[PDB]
Design an enzyme around this catalytic site. Structure first.
Site, PDB file in Angstrom:
ATOM      1  CG  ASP A 196     -69.699 -25.865  46.312  1.00  0.00           C
ATOM      2  OD1 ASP A 196     -68.597 -25.720  46.897  1.00  0.00           O
ATOM      3  OD2 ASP A 196     -69.787 -25.777  45.086  1.00  0.00           O
TER       4      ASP A 196
ATOM      5  CB  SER B 258     -68.194 -23.412  43.530  1.00  0.00           C
ATOM      6  OG  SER B 258     -67.921 -24.801  43.632  1.00  0.00           O
TER       7      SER B 258
ATOM      8  CG  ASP C 276     -54.259 -22.211  50.157  1.00  0.00           C
ATOM      9  OD1 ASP C 276     -54.041 -21.035  50.530  1.00  0.00           O
ATOM     10  OD2 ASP C 276     -55.266 -22.849  50.524  1.00  0.00           O
TER      11      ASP C 276
ATOM     12  CG  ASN D 253     -67.952 -28.329  41.813  1.00  0.00           C
ATOM     13  OD1 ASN D 253     -67.654 -29.456  41.429  1.00  0.00           O
ATOM     14  ND2 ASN D 253     -67.237 -27.266  41.543  1.00  0.00           N
TER      15      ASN D 253
ATOM     16  CG  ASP E 274     -64.461 -27.351  39.459  1.00  0.00           C
ATOM     17  OD1 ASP E 274     -64.212 -26.687  40.477  1.00  0.00           O
ATOM     18  OD2 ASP E 274     -64.838 -28.530  39.493  1.00  0.00           O
TER      19      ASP E 274
ATOM     20  CD  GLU F  80     -58.877 -31.439  38.063  1.00  0.00           C
ATOM     21  OE1 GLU F  80     -60.095 -31.311  37.784  1.00  0.00           O
ATOM     22  OE2 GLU F  80     -58.455 -31.786  39.196  1.00  0.00           O
TER      23      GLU F  80
ATOM     24  CG  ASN G 176     -64.399 -24.460  43.194  1.00  0.00           C
ATOM     25  OD1 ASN G 176     -64.643 -23.842  44.224  1.00  0.00           O
ATOM     26  ND2 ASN G 176     -65.316 -25.164  42.559  1.00  0.00           N
TER      27      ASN G 176
END
Ligand SMILES: [K+]
Ligand SMILES: [K+]
Length: 129
Positions: free
Chosen positions: A48, A50, A101, A46, A52, A35, A59
């Site tokens: 969209d 957002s 999650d 990203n 990281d 990562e 994120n």
């Protein structure tokens, strides 16, 4: 801060990640490797909108607030900047919510594509733990 491999393994273990949700320490080190290359200041934008953040590239759409991800949530109740600290506490504590999650470590696409099913123990071999 750019952690060494064993240095990060030791810090992750101290903060409870070894076998957390059943994932051995090597899984977390492998995930951090691909990562962020072990860099707490890593960021990735990203498509969209957002971003990281940090050693586990957490994120902003769901997990932290950066003020620039419209519609997003802040489930770890932290500014995303906290995920860039040399102290990995915030990243680890948020990662614990993420891996709890429902999809386990598949939440990290780099873990799924590059760590899952591999000899992840190798990432902690040689470390004084
Ligand atoms: K926002
Ligand atoms: K799981």
């Amino acid at each position: 801060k750019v952690f060494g491999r064993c240095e990060l393994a030791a810090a992750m273990k101290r903060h409870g990640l070894d076998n957390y949700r059943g994932y051995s320490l090597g899984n977390w080190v492998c995930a951090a490797k691909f990562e962020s290359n072990f860099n707490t200041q890593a960021t990735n934008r990203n498509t969209d909108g957002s971003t990281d953040y940090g050693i586990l590239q957490i994120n902003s759409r769901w997990w932290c607030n950066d003020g620039r991800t419209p519609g997003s949530r802040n489930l770890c109740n932290i500014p995303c900047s906290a995920l860039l600290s040399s102290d990995i506490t915030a990243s680890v504590n948020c990662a614990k919510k993420i891996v709890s999650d429902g999809n386990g470590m598949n939440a990290w696409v780099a873990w799924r594509n590059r760590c899952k099913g591999t000899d992840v123990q190798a990432w902690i071999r040689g470390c004084r733990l």
